[PDB]
Scaffold this active site. Structure first.
Site, PDB file in Angstrom:
ATOM      1  N   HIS A 110       0.824  -1.060  -0.401  1.00 30.55           N
ATOM      2  CA  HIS A 110       0.047  -0.316   0.048  1.00 30.55           C
ATOM      3  C   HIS A 110       1.114   1.029   0.396  1.00 30.55           C
ATOM      4  CE1 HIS A 110       0.009  -0.070   4.296  1.00 30.55           C
ATOM      5  NE2 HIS A 110       0.093   1.419   4.470  1.00 30.55           N
ATOM      6  N   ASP A 126      -0.195  -7.492   1.387  1.00 35.42           N
ATOM      7  CA  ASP A 126       0.351  -6.045   1.331  1.00 35.42           C
ATOM      8  C   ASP A 126       2.326  -6.255   1.347  1.00 35.42           C
ATOM      9  OD1 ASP A 126       0.407  -3.715   1.872  1.00 35.42           O
ATOM     10  OD2 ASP A 126      -0.402  -3.144   3.742  1.00 35.42           O
ATOM     11  N   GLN A 161      -0.630   6.345  11.277  1.00 36.17           N
ATOM     12  CA  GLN A 161      -0.826   7.275   9.827  1.00 36.17           C
ATOM     13  C   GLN A 161       0.926   7.305  10.225  1.00 36.17           C
ATOM     14  OE1 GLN A 161      -3.638   6.509  10.520  1.00 36.17           O
ATOM     15  NE2 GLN A 161      -5.101   5.437   8.703  1.00 36.17           N
ATOM     16  N   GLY A 162       1.515   6.856   8.498  1.00 40.53           N
ATOM     17  CA  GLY A 162       3.064   7.135   8.344  1.00 40.53           C
ATOM     18  C   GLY A 162       3.937   6.531   8.748  1.00 40.53           C
ATOM     19  N   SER A 218       3.175   3.032   7.920  1.00 46.56           N
ATOM     20  CA  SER A 218       3.323   1.736   7.401  1.00 46.56           C
ATOM     21  C   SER A 218       4.475   1.621   6.702  1.00 46.56           C
ATOM     22  CB  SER A 218       2.255   2.995   5.892  1.00 46.56           C
ATOM     23  OG  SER A 218       1.089   3.124   6.531  1.00 46.56           O
ATOM     24  N   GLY A 219       4.215  -0.226   6.389  1.00 50.89           N
ATOM     25  CA  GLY A 219       5.458  -0.009   5.426  1.00 50.89           C
ATOM     26  C   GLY A 219       6.932  -0.044   6.552  1.00 50.89           C
TER      27      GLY A 219
END
Ligand SMILES: [Ca+2]
Length: 223
Positions: A40, A84, A174-175, A177-178
């Protein structure tokens, strides 16, 4: 990261920031030329920033390297977030040192109850918004599959696990992510999704990296 602590500069040497004019996702350095992140997080124009602490200040240990290729997992579904995961190849090899270092891939999956380290530059507030400059960290246990599925009826696949605290207050956000979930020195998770951040009964959900080791290795071997 909500409810975490300041990691300390370069204490998480595999943590990368993905930058497209600004930080937008984390990732994990897995060898001198390759980063693992969330599917994502895919977009064009990615510069990988290694050796970061304060993402707004050049502090002297950074390496900035553009991506040459991104590979989203073939089976990624952006509606369910199943699979993901994405690989990013660097245009040149990073110079590895004590502050820029790869994280080992798992040889076995990790069990509920294992303590892990989750890190990132995401929002630090569960209501409201505040984005940190320096890297934040959170120690959190993997939760049982049954508690994960009970928290998120109809949404947890075999490629996902929950980690965190059912009481709320401590979570990725949030942020983040990954970015990495590291347990006993192995990359076991990727920050994937959740319902809000740090909410009671809604722990973070993470891509189960151990399911992807064969795909990662074979992809790297031919790209
Ligand atoms: Ca910096």
């Amino acid at each position: 990261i909500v409810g975490g602590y300041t990691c300390g500069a370069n204490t998480v040497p595999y943590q990368v920031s993905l930058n497209s004019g600004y930080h937008f996702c984390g990732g994990s350095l897995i060898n001198s030329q390759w980063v693992v992140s969330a599917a994502h997080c895919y977009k064009s124009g990615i510069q990988v920033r290694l050796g970061e602490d304060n993402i707004n200040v050049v502090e002297g240990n950074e390496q900035f390297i553009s991506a040459s290729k991104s590979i989203v997992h073939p089976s990624y579904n952006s509606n369910t977030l199943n699979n993901d995961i994405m690989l990013i190849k660097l245009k040149s090899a990073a110079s590895l040192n004590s502050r820029v270092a790869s994280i080992s891939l798992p040889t076995s999956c990790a069990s509920a109850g294992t303590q892990c380290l989750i890190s990132g530059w995401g929002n630090t507030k569960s209501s409201g918004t505040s984005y940190p400059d320096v890297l934040k960290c959170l120690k959190a246990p993997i939760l049982s599959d049954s508690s994960c599925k009970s928290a998120y009826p109809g949404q947890i696949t075999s490629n996902m696990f929950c980690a965190g605290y059912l009481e709320g207050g401590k979570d990725s956000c949030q942020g983040d992510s990954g970015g990495p979930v590291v347990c006993s020195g192995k990359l076991q998770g990727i920050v994937s999704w959740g319902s809000g951040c740090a909410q009671k009964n809604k722990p973070g959900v993470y891509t189960k990296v151990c399911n992807y080791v064969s795909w990662i290795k074979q992809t790297i071997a031919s790209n």
